[PDB]
């Protein structure tokens, strides 16, 4: 419920400058990254979190936060630390951890 | 009707190897296409040209040819010059520009 508001904020146009690498599942074939599925065992994106929210797949707020961070964790695991997507991941995670902390 | 033959030829299997990026409108919901409508203000594809022909929107051959080139113009503007799809647009445009010529 309050996670649904968090999901709207990550998908809001305000943060679209750095949240767009996570709007859809990673296409390992279109980006030249065939070893992505050898390294990443559990992909996650915001369209997948959104689908699992509308279908009610999260039992509580912690499962929601687990999927969101996994989407950030895969970026930290797969990309080099100086990569552009990691800078966008840090900023979007900074937005998440704030809205998720200041819940009731 | 000289344009209808041009439309069926671009949509035929003879050019399906490089004409498939233009069969349908660009899906801006793909991984990194969320900015297509911020950059391209007049989208165009071949399903709309067929739908503007079946609804009989084109008055003359200058109205038909204008939309087809806009569809190629959007591809050159949005995509990098070394991308395959611009090469696919260059290859397909030569087929169009000399049936219309």
């Amino acid at each position: 419920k309050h996670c649904n508001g968090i999901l709207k904020e990550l998908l809001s146009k305000k943060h679209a400058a750095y949240a767009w690498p996570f709007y859809k599942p990673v296409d390992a074939s279109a980006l030249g990254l065939h070893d992505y599925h050898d390294i990443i065992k559990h992909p996650m994106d915001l369209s997948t979190v959104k689908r699992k929210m509308e279908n009610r797949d999260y039992r509580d707020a912690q499962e929601f936060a687990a999927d969101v961070r996994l989407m950030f964790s895969n970026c930290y695991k797969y990309n080099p630390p100086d990569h552009d997507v990691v800078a966008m991941a840090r900023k979007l995670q900074d937005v998440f951890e704030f809205r998720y902390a200041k819940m009731p | 009707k000289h344009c209808n033959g041009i439309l069926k030829e671009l949509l035929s299997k003879k050019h399906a190897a490089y004409a498939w990026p233009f069969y349908k409108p660009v899906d801006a919901s793909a991984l990194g296409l969320h900015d297509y409508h911020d950059i391209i203000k007049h989208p165009m594809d071949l399903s709309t040209v067929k739908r503007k022909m079946e609804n009989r929107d084109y008055r003359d051959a200058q109205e038909f040819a204008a939309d087809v080139r806009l569809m190629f113009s959007n591809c050159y503007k949005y995509n990098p010059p070394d991308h395959d799809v611009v090469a696919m647009a260059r290859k397909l445009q030569d087929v169009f520009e000399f049936r219309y010529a």
Binding site: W20, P21, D27, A30, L31, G32, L33, N79, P80, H83, D84, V85 | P21, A30, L31, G32, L33, H34, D35, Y36, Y78, N79, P80, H83, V85
Partner: peptide, 11 residues
């Protein structure tokens, strides 16, 4: 798969 933004996702 074909934009300028999606080149940033490339390593």
């Amino acid at each position: 798969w074909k934009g300028y933004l999606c080149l940033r996702k490339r390593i």
